[PDB]
Amino acid sequence: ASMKVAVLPGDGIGPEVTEAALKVLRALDEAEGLGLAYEVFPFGGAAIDAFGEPFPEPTRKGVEEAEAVLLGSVGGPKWDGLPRKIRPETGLLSLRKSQDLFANLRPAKVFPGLERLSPLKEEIARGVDVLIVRELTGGIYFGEPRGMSEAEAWNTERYSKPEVERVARVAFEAARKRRKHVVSVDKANVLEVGEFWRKTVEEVGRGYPDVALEHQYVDAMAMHLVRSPARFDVVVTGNIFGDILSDLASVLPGSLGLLPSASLGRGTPVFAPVHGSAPDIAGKGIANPTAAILSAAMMLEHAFGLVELARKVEDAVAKALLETPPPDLGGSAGTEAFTATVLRHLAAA
Amino acid sequence: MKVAVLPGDGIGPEVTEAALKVLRALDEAEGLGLAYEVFPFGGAAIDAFGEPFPEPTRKGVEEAEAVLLGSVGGPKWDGLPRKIRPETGLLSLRKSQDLFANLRPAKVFPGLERLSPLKEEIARGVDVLIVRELTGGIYFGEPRGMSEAEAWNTERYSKPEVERVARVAFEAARKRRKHVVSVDKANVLEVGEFWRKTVEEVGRGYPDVALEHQYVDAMAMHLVRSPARFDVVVTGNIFGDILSDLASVLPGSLGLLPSASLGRGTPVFAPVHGSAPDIAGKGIANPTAAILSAAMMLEHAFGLVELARKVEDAVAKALLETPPPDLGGSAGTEAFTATVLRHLA
């Protein structure tokens, strides 16, 4: 034991794609002597049914004591209509908030030679390599007042200066290690909170003169991200806009089953697919495990500094996608078979 | 046929003049008795009256039967504070006329599949109508404000605001393919939960219309991967704004998308697109959105359905024949407009 991991499989396809990532981690552990140890803990729907709440105390303790969390998606029709304070999705929010993981990193990269897998023509998809840095613990997701009566409902989009500054800082540090361009995304032409966001990111950027800074309104950014995506490096934005733009960015490599994420901040870092619990395909052994696998690759790199191992996983996934694509990308490889293709390539390298 | 023309800033006057030439040729051929006046709006109005929506412009709008609007904004006024900027005049126009229903159609015209960046088999038969709630939500909700330490805005909806925009979407679907998808973020936000429940209630009044829900992040992906499966898409102010820019990738360019804003007061017809300051002055701006917006005015404000269709057919032919630069072609604004007219005649 010198790599300590909390595994939180979730609901629907969550446990299916998470098991696939685990077989990749185990294969790497044995091949490399990583000294991996992990414990599995209930989370989401599975936790509501067993403990009455989505993020129970033994799961919080497992999270606190691990060096990293490999997380599966939560949610489904089974839990429709729960009091909000115990919904599977509120447990996910609590996870994020209790560890103060304010920086959500969502990369979208179109692998050379896989441009054809996109719904868009190859010239738009070619070369795409974008990093969305989404503010994860603030904005409308956590703001108060919030509630609902018979006549109306209300939620508050709000940000303070230090919340914007700390996410902006992460996006500049990231850009400095990439291609030194940040686009900051807001609705400053309509909303006081966008004006505030913009001005604060402008101030932070004065601390990073080596990084080019551009602003776009969220509606134009959505259009640009599908017409000119190759022209973007880092994209920094608030909680809700980052959620929308990151599901949108899946159309670049061509499916939502491809996109990984890392959530970083004060406590235990969390690695998880962008995608949800996909109840329409759960139980059919077809869910694309690429997001989960690449999330384990982000864990290797960011939580454990194992950059070269992360790159080997990524390359093994890109070859498996070219060779035996899963059904969401027009191919026939189920979860188990795709995962075996990834392992074969790993072992060959 | 009495019309207020509000040309706006950047490409706004350029594409608006193009739509006017189409309207004039139509007036002569058809004897519409068109009568229009031009009013200052946006930056052009800030510079001449110190405000983006001045009194003679409000009076022009009140007294017209329809407004043909040009886009507003640009770097020139970036240094004004928001509350007096060109975009706040747009919001005031909408609010004063209580135009709560914004109609933004995204169609791949039969034959123009090649113009879309989507593979042809994804783009075939795509015909989506976004119905966006225009006068409520975070755009207008109180409290809103800003201090040195923080800023806030309120995403707020009341039951009647949701019911009336839901009705409009159900009526529109009943005349189309009888499917509505309603979009929210009900899994995180009380206001989405409330939107969803109220749309469900209104839908019980339209058993001929199928009703589906999507969360806004999945909707954005589905609108690009499987656009052919949507008819009407109903949503709140900010989600509607984002989804409808995104929807431009279906026919192929933002410069193609028209809009109508309908409600209590004078109806407003205008491109989805903004003032495009990065191309203003170059004679290249695609005027299709402005021309198709004039077509929507003909249909929705004047009941001239077959004329609208004729405008739309001439645009489609011109697009196939002399495409503007945003669609991989070389036809500038004047030349593209001339192609439209030749097909009209």
Ligand SMILES: NC(=O)c1ccc[n+]([C@@H]2O[C@H](COP(=O)([O-])OP(=O)(O)OC[C@H]3O[C@@H](n4cnc5c(N)ncnc54)[C@H](O)[C@@H]3O)[C@@H](O)[C@H]2O)c1
């Ligand atoms: N981090 C999370 O736990 C997370 C994230 C998003 C949504 N959710 C929850 O998941 C449930 C489903 O919500 P949704 O449908 O809007 O989002 P979703 O991401 O689960 O699925 C959206 C679409 O993509 C497809 N898809 C998703 N992952 C895939 C994969 N790995 N392989 C192949 N296809 C895949 C799904 O079938 C569906 O068509 C809801 O209960 C929602 O609250 C959870």
Ligand SMILES: NC(=O)c1ccc[n+]([C@@H]2O[C@H](COP(=O)([O-])OP(=O)(O)OC[C@H]3O[C@@H](n4cnc5c(N)ncnc54)[C@H](O)[C@@H]3O)[C@@H](O)[C@H]2O)c1
């Ligand atoms: N209804 C409106 O008045 C309205 C709507 C949106 C934006 N705006 C304002 O427009 C200005 C620029 O905003 P923006 O860049 O975020 O969005 P935009 O819609 O003005 O331009 C977006 C992109 O698409 C291009 N584009 C837009 N219309 C085009 C056309 N007819 N032909 C060819 N290309 C076109 C532009 O060159 C730019 O690359 C800002 O001041 C903004 O507030 C106004």
Ligand SMILES: CC(C)[C@H](C(=O)O)[C@@H](O)C(=O)O
């Ligand atoms: C399940 C929900 C809380 C979540 C979010 O909006 O953050 C999900 O959509 C995601 O993208 O991770």
Ligand SMILES: CC(C)[C@H](C(=O)O)[C@@H](O)C(=O)O
């Ligand atoms: C300019 C702005 C106020 C407007 C909106 O967000 O409604 C524009 O983006 C649009 O899409 O019409």
Ligand SMILES: [K+]
């Ligand atoms: K650590």
Ligand SMILES: [Mn+2]
């Ligand atoms: Mn999401």
Ligand SMILES: [Mn+2]
């Ligand atoms: Mn817009």
